[PDB]
Amino acid sequence: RPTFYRQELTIWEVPERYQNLSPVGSGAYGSVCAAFDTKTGLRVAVKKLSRPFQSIIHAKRTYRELRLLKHMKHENVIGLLDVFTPARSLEEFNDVYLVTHLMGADLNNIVKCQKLTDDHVQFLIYQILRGLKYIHSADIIHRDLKPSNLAVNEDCELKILDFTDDEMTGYVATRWYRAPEIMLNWMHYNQTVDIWSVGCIMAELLTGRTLFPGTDHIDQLKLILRLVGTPGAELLKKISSESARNYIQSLTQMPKMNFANVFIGANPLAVDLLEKMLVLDSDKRITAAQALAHAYFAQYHDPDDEPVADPYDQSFESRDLLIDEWKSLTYDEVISFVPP
């Protein structure tokens, strides 16, 4: 067990390897301090979770995040550098702290400061798909990819990060990258959801503009359908909601637009990739693995440096358990943490 010192920044009790903690973040998830890991020389983010086992749901959520973060071992995905609790036994256990690389800036911040170049776009999207091949191989779905969840360092190296209905109403970035099928609950979703988000992110990097700045769900749908065309019959069959099907049916049929006239002057290989990603029917979208083989990434594509993940068992998602059982599974995961 390391030695822990306590200081009030909230009271943080952290191992003394973590020095010079400086408060930088907070919010109902947890407070975040920036710190210097003397032992790895890394600059780190230390998150003290807010109320982790306050409710079956919160306990299960705590558990899920820890389980996810401990799984991820890939250049382009955030991983867990460390997790700890000052508690010396399950009975004492209450606080969870998660330690990750202090991140430089997210993709939005990059963009605010810079005009990107097709080479930058090439490289940045490559990395996302590389990360996602890994993520998807473990059958994990990020379901919330957005420029704010992508951390880009000074060398254009990127990590996928992070992983309520009012918060998705209106003119909001929380919804603009969402695949239609989940934005309107057309059908059960799967990983193809993320490739849609990548299409939206890529286009925006190529144009400097939100691809679908919907003012609300229905406006956004209209924007999507104008670009990709309204649903044909095959996909209609797959939307299980009769009302949704009905509503789509009320909209005047429109054909796919010409993407070369929408993304004027973009590299045709980018244009071609966008069309493969932005397909309304999820079943027909390109997968991250396949996209990585797309000519647009010839300068970066290495099939022997694009690894897949170890299995992620998420059977717990189907499990109903009491707070204290979730809590105990979390304590277990805390204490088995093997450092990187």
Curated annotation (Swiss-Prot):
Listed InterPro entries: Kinase-like_dom_sf, MAP_kinase, MAP_kinase_CS, MAPK14, MAPK_p38-like, Prot_kinase_dom, Protein_kinase_ATP_BS
PTM annotation (Phosphothreonine): residues: T10, T169, T252
Free-text description of this protein's post-translational modifications in UniProt: Dually phosphorylated on Thr-169 and Tyr-171 by the MAP2Ks MAP2K3/MKK3, MAP2K4/MKK4 and MAP2K6/MKK6 in response to inflammatory citokines, environmental stress or growth factors, which activates the enzyme. Dual phosphorylation can also be mediated by TAB1-mediated autophosphorylation. TCR engagement in T-cells also leads to Tyr-312 phosphorylation by ZAP70. Dephosphorylated and inactivated by DUPS1, DUSP10 and DUSP16. PPM1D also mediates dephosphorylation and inactivation of MAPK14.
UniProt: ATP binding residues: V24, G25, S26, G27, A28, Y29, G30, S31, V32, K47
Outcome (variant: D165A): Emulation of the active state. Increase in activity
Entry's Gene Ontology molecular function annotations: ATP binding; enzyme binding; MAP kinase activity; MAP kinase kinase activity; mitogen-activated protein kinase p38 binding; NFAT protein binding; protein phosphatase binding; protein serine kinase activity
Sequence positions bearing Phosphotyrosine: Y171, Y312
UniProt keyword annotation of Transcription regulation present: yes
Activity regulation details: Activated by cell stresses such as DNA damage, heat shock, osmotic shock, anisomycin and sodium arsenite, as well as pro-inflammatory stimuli such as bacterial lipopolysaccharide (LPS) and interleukin-1. Activation occurs through dual phosphorylation of Thr-169 and Tyr-171 by either of two dual specificity kinases, MAP2K3/MKK3 or MAP2K6/MKK6, and potentially also MAP2K4/MKK4, as well as by TAB1-mediated autophosphorylation.
Name the UniProt record assigns to this protein: Mitogen-activated protein kinase 14
UniProt source species: Homo sapiens
